[PDB]
Amino acid sequence: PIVVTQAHIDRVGIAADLLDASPVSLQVLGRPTAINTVVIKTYIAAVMELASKQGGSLAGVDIRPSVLLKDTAIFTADVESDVDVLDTGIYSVPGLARKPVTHRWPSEGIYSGVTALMGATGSGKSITLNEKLRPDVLIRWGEVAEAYDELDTAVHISTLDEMLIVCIGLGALGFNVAVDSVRPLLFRLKGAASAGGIVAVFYSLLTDISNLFTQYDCSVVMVVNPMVDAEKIEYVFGQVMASTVGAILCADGNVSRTMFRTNKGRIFN
Amino acid sequence: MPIVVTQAHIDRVGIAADLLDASPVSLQVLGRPTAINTVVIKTYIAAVMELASKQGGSLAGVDIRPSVLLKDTAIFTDVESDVDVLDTGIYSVPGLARKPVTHRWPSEGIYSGVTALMGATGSGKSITLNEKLRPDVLIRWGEVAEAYDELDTAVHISTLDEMLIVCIGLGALGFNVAVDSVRPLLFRLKGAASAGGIVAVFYSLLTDISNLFTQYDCSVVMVVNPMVDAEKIEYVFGQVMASTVGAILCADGNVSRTMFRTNKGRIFN
Amino acid sequence: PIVVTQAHIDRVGIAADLLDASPVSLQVLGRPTAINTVVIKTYIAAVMELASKQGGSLAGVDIRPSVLLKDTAIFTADVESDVDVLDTGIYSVPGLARKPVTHRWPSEGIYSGVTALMGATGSGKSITLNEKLRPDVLIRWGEVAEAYDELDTAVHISTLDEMLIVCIGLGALGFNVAVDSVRPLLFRLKGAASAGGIVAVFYSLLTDISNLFTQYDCSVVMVVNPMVDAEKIEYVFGQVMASTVGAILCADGNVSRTMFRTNKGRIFN
Amino acid sequence: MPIVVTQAHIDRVGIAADLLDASPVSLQVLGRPTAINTVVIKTYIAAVMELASKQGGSLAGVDIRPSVLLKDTAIFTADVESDVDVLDTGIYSVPGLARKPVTHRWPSEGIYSGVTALMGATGSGKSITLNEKLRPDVLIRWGEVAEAYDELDTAVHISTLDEMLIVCIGLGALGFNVAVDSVRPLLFRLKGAASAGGIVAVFYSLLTDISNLFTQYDCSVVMVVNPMVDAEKIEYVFGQVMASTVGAILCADGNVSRTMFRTNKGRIFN
Amino acid sequence: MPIVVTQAHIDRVGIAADLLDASPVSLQVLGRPTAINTVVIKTYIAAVMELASKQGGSLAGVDIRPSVLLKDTAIFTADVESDVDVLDTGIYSVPGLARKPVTHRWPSEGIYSGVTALMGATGSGKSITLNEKLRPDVLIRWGEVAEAYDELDTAVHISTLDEMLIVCIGLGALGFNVAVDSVRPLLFRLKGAASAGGIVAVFYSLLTDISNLFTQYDCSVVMVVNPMVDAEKIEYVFGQVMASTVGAILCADGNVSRTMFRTNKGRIFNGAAPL
Amino acid sequence: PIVVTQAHIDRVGIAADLLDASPVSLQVLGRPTAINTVVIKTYIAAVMELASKQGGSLAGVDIRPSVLLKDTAIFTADVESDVDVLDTGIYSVPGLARKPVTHRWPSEGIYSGVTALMGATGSGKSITLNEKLRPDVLIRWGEVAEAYDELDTAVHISTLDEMLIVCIGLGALGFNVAVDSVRPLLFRLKGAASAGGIVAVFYSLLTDISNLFTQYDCSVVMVVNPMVDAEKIEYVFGQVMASTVGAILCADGNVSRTMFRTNKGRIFN
Ligand SMILES: Nc1ncnc2c1ncn2[C@@H]1O[C@H](COP(=O)(O)OP(=O)(O)O)[C@@H](O)[C@H]1O
Ligand SMILES: Nc1ncnc2c1ncn2[C@@H]1O[C@H](COP(=O)(O)OP(=O)(O)O)[C@@H](O)[C@H]1O
Ligand SMILES: Nc1ncnc2c1ncn2[C@@H]1O[C@H](COP(=O)(O)OP(=O)(O)O)[C@@H](O)[C@H]1O
Ligand SMILES: Nc1ncnc2c1ncn2[C@@H]1O[C@H](COP(=O)(O)OP(=O)(O)O)[C@@H](O)[C@H]1O
Ligand SMILES: Nc1ncnc2c1ncn2[C@@H]1O[C@H](COP(=O)(O)OP(=O)(O)O)[C@@H](O)[C@H]1O
Ligand SMILES: Nc1ncnc2c1ncn2[C@@H]1O[C@H](COP(=O)(O)OP(=O)(O)O)[C@@H](O)[C@H]1O
Ligand SMILES: [Ca+2]
Ligand SMILES: [Ca+2]
Ligand SMILES: [Ca+2]
Ligand SMILES: [Ca+2]
Ligand SMILES: [Ca+2]
Ligand SMILES: [Ca+2]
């Protein structure tokens, strides 16, 4: 189950302050799109109200945004991925001038941001996540029917808006949020593939997502599975390390490599 | 050869309508998410049952084609394949929080979803499907004139809308539905080819199709034959295993490899 | 000459029936487009009247659609080849529930559909077509001035609409129709080339064309010579066999390989 | 150097007008089929004959350029992209001739009417072979830098594709031996995905459509075709072009490497 | 860690305003030339000086971010595609300086005004070289993950390209040693067909246009440029970048592998000078 | 300095006759665009008027078009680079029926047109141009701050319109005009790269530019440095020789190869 502590209740006000304090946007190959902070606040309030209906114990099924919110839109005519970058402009989510809030998960003293759980298909990513990492909230997206779907920690989403709502919303409150998988986004990323058989904007998106979590004191682990050649995975993992607060590589059911940006410094394996 | 409607099928009609109304679904490829009109599937089920009532329950595949039973066969209610992912949004069909309904076909105790019948051209996919699999309903799409077209189990479709209508409609009632083949969709998949000489959205589509069947308690076998190199088929089959409930590989008229997600767990050969 | 037998006259009524009974469309990378059946019927009527005015012995020049019909259009604002597959939908011409009508040409007991006469430039396709296959009607499209143009069996077309009119129109009556060539359609196929250096929709088009002939009891031989590498022709011929009722490979002025789907079964060489 | 108008040319004027009016033609590339205004070609022929009459039959290539003789040089009669559905634009190929083509003595004996492609790498001797070995009656110069051939009285300097077809169909139908050096402005602007041989497939369709356009109007034209292709891939492309033209000439190190001509005595390879 | 405003900076304010008004500039990429609103840069300089005055000369990078000081951060003043005819859009390059450019002591001695490009593969030590060896006065942080450099009082966190140019031209003209870590948000969103070296050709034109923009406004800027390029094509890309900037530094294995600086003493390739 | 001789003053009338006599246009991948001859005439008049106010000694800074003309536009709604060639038409600047005016620069007896100074980055193109070629007017465009910018012969431009104005305007008068560089145009050439890793229209543009100078009796040297592989430069240089009146290749600070079309014939090294 997903148990709501007094620590989570005390973070509600702070979470609302963090969201209102900084206006954020996101961009991919098109034009920068603003994130409606209000929706995340509304989600937190809905989760707290339901938590109150129960004994603080929540079922992942009951906290899905499609059930709690009338509208699940976070992004507020249509632009092509091959338009002039000077007509659309360029946006990256700004960094934190202050020291980021540290966490005990996925690693000790890790800064707020995003961790990428990498590896080839069947390398043990989902296994490593649920057995070793053991998240408080397990977001399930674009993955076939598995044993992890029967878990009361599992929250089934359909859109990118829903992913960010649950990640920012619950992550800000102090929950250890995880996403399995981020394949719906990755496999629909349109554009010319750069060095490593993957679009360059993929690395920019990971940085923008990481900083979005750093700003809202979230500690999120995302399963990032790329359609990349068996030997080109090492290059891509090195490139992802420069774009995320955390990075975990899986090979043959075990953890091959690690990288974490902590209060004790950047730790490699 | 005939398609017989048992009392078991009649008793599932109400449940099928209940599953369809309970969850609103959509589908996305490289464009924008498009909603699926559930009502059309319900209307199809009612038309099949009405005809089964007039006949002895012994129905001919020719008489149950949607173009004949329905006035309009549309299930989806103009965007380029190279449009910003943030302007269209991303959609994946949500997972099942509950345990999926098990089936005896194509394998014992297999969960509801999709099975991909893979193999090179002339590897014996169509032969394995009809002789070894023995499906109740055989959907024939984008295939040249063969002996399987003269079968009373054969239902000849033209559109993707029709495929989903027969698959969800009859599959929900408990019928063992099969599609030979899904080639018109695969060969019209526009986009930049990823690792393995195939567009990445192909794997996302298989997962979205699988989850669509998992949600509506369907057990469907689709023969998937995409344009891929003779040696690159092993990589693609491994990737498809991570995107479907079932996977069957054909080589020299026989079954080379198998993967099934059952109540007894994931079984490899 | 092109001689009209009583057997052809007796098929006129059956041809109008077949054409009215099933509404057909065609799709490539755009949106599905309906085929106006009336135009084919109008063409048959104009050919029969001219055959009745002359001695039954017609000249290919006199039966060209541009001469017999006021308008040659078969297809009834503008869509790009890179448009979302979900916005246009997917269409494949439906298969035949009944047994297809057999023919003695290009092979004994062959089912109605299309035969692809394949080979590199100067492999002997056009020689094999005119000397070994001996067609009744020879449609000449996208080819330079050759000896075959002076033949009384030769009918010179300009559009794809005209090709289908003569193929379906005369083919349905029992004539052995051949197209030399289909290069104006192949070389103008816009899209990203799949495995084998050729667009995947090419194989779907051959199946759709074949089934169009299977439905209207036609036996057509099309010379198909797409821009493909000298060594990649074997792979492409292999994929084409899985997309057509007949397949003939030319090399060094002679027949290299054959495949025919007959009443006695699929025959390979 | 001069362009002389014989009685044979004068006697063909009526026949040329008949050939043009008899068959309506179009052209297509990656967009939609575009009709060719036959009237413009007839108007050009009339202007050339009138000037030939004022002179002694002896004409200067400079004086017979379409931009000088016609007020409007347009042959093709809102805007479509090269990546549009083939089914929405339709497909057009210029129809073949049911009758025997009109044979010529140039570039080869008994060669049928149509187009000949003068191929070869850059500096292989295409322009040299064209002017020294071929000896054309009319030399169309297009998209080529300043050379000795521009000072020739046979040289007619054009700017558009419309102008090329006007001079090729107009003068070729009358019986003149017309040549184009070169067709690089069309080839280098051919938009589309490059097929096998590092060149767009529609290139081969265009050569056939151009050939048949000349076959129908009994024109004997030699076009120097030099597309951007790899040094070793030229052999493959030349073989493919042979299947798309009435004539084909390959140049290598200033000399003629290979030949192909479709004649009344049959197809002749070297 | 702090950003100190000297009398030298105060004396440059007028000079900077004149430089901006004297020459009208634009920028182009694959679309239509877009004009740069000089007024916004002047307004930013005035806001920085006014705040420097309220504080004791010393300023915090957080307080000088354009989003905080200006009501609108737009520098570029309907929508054109990256694949439009070059003749329908025309071509624009920022013009060169007819006079001798203002020399600087940073990033190299006697260097001309313009842009310096700090190259290297990922984890080659670009950010380390920038902060330890180069020591910039103002550190612009853009599209980079949470690092130790973000806690620095020299760090100014931006989000747009408009903001980058405002801080670079605005503070750089006054005499500050401005650095950008990273320029990746721009590089990773460069739409177009990749040329030789697995990178769009307009990338090199943009570096030259950015360099000349700084040469005209007497700025000395160091931009860290991380290219999505294969391990073996980095040498080719660097050679090409050297021909497009006033300064270029290559990083490899935590150290400086190669340098190029256009100084008053001439073009110096791989000099004996610690940064 | 830039000195105006009596020879230049005597050419003013002839330059107007040349510009008025032939209407010209330019095309790239879009539609043909007319060149407004009047603007070039206006520029010549402004240069001569200023040369008069001076002692015949002009500063390159004072003769820049942005300073002398109110509007710098030469080309007189918006078309895509991937539009049908038949809808835009094709334009090449026409050749000269007469013998071209000869020059003593960059080579003895060279015909009027364009010379391409080629070579890898840092091969010594700019060095060869200013030390060995010694041009009368050095147009500086899209190049970084160098010693050549402080030269009184240097004229700094921003647009392609400005380049052609100075090249045609001053070149027609007899000045030895050079451009360092033509990179702003070359690095913004949109389209599919042909053989040699460069767009085919690049070679057509060089010929069109060369013929534009041949028609207006100009002798211009352009630094052409396109993004091409280290080994592919030899192929491209050979192709450029077939597209220009002059061609110079640079390697390791020295001149590797030369080609000039003179009154004494085509001279190779
Ligand atoms: N093709 C295969 N054959 C055998 N076992 C496999 C195969 N693919 C995966 N496995 C098993 O599944 C485990 C990985 O499961 P999982 O965590 O779901 O992988 P991932 O999330 O990376 O796709 C492996 O350690 C192995 O035991
Ligand atoms: N090229 C070939 N040569 C010989 N036999 C072939 C060939 N291609 C297919 N076959 C025969 O057809 C069988 C496969 O039929 P089928 O099930 O229709 O294949 P698929 O559906 O995979 O295309 C093979 O087992 C073999 O007996
Ligand atoms: N490159 C060539 N060299 C020599 N003869 C050739 C060549 N190409 C074709 N031929 C001749 O033409 C014949 C093939 O003719 P044809 O059927 O028209 O070819 P295609 O396969 O292109 O339709 C060959 O048998 C040979 O006699
Ligand atoms: N790179 C070169 N080196 C030496 N001579 C050359 C070179 N390129 C061309 N030539 C000379 O020019 C002749 C070819 O001239 P030309 O007919 O104009 O060629 P093309 O029209 O095929 O481009 C060759 O036979 C040779 O004498
Ligand atoms: N894969 C790695 N394994 C070990 N150390 C690494 C790795 N990647 C980077 N480092 C360390 O980080 C340093 C580079 O840090 P940084 O300046 O942030 O690089 P950059 O800015 O070029 O991405 C290296 O000198 C090395 O000590
Ligand atoms: N990577 C380098 N290493 C050393 N010297 C170099 C390098 N690149 C250029 N140079 C020097 O600069 C000279 C070339 O200068 P320049 O004319 O500006 O070249 P270009 O115009 O072709 O880019 C060379 O002759 C050499 O002395
Ligand atoms: Ca998994
Ligand atoms: Ca099959
Ligand atoms: Ca042939
Ligand atoms: Ca030539
Ligand atoms: Ca860094
Ligand atoms: Ca230079």
Residue numbers in the entry:
A (entry chain K), C (entry chain I), F (entry chain A): 2 to 77, 84 to 276
B (entry chain J): 1 to 77, 85 to 276
D (entry chain B): 1 to 77, 84 to 276
E (entry chain L): 1 to 77, 84 to 281
Task: Reproduce text from the manuscript describing this model.
We use bacteriophage φ6, a member of the Cystoviridae family, as a model system to study the assembly of a complicated multi-shelled virus. The inner T=1 shell, composed of protein P1, forms a dodecahedral polymerase complex (PC) harbouring the three viral dsRNA segments (S, M, and L), the viral polymerase P2, the hexameric packaging protein P4, and the assembly cofactor P7. Here we present the structure of φ6 NC to near-atomic resolution using electron cryomicroscopy and single particle analysis.
Local areas corresponding to P4 hexamers were extracted from the NC images and reconstructed as single particles with six-fold symmetry (‘P4 hexamer reconstruction') or without any symmetry (‘NC vertex reconstruction'). However, in earlier low-resolution cryo-EM reconstructions, the P4 hexamers appeared to float on top of the five-fold vertexes of the P1 shell23 and the connections between these symmetry-mismatched components have remained unresolved. Binding of up to five of the six flexible C-terminal tails of P4 provides an elegant solution to the symmetry mismatch. These tails are likely to be disordered in solution and to order only upon binding to P1 during assembly. It is thus likely that each P4 grabs five and not more P1A–P1B dimers.
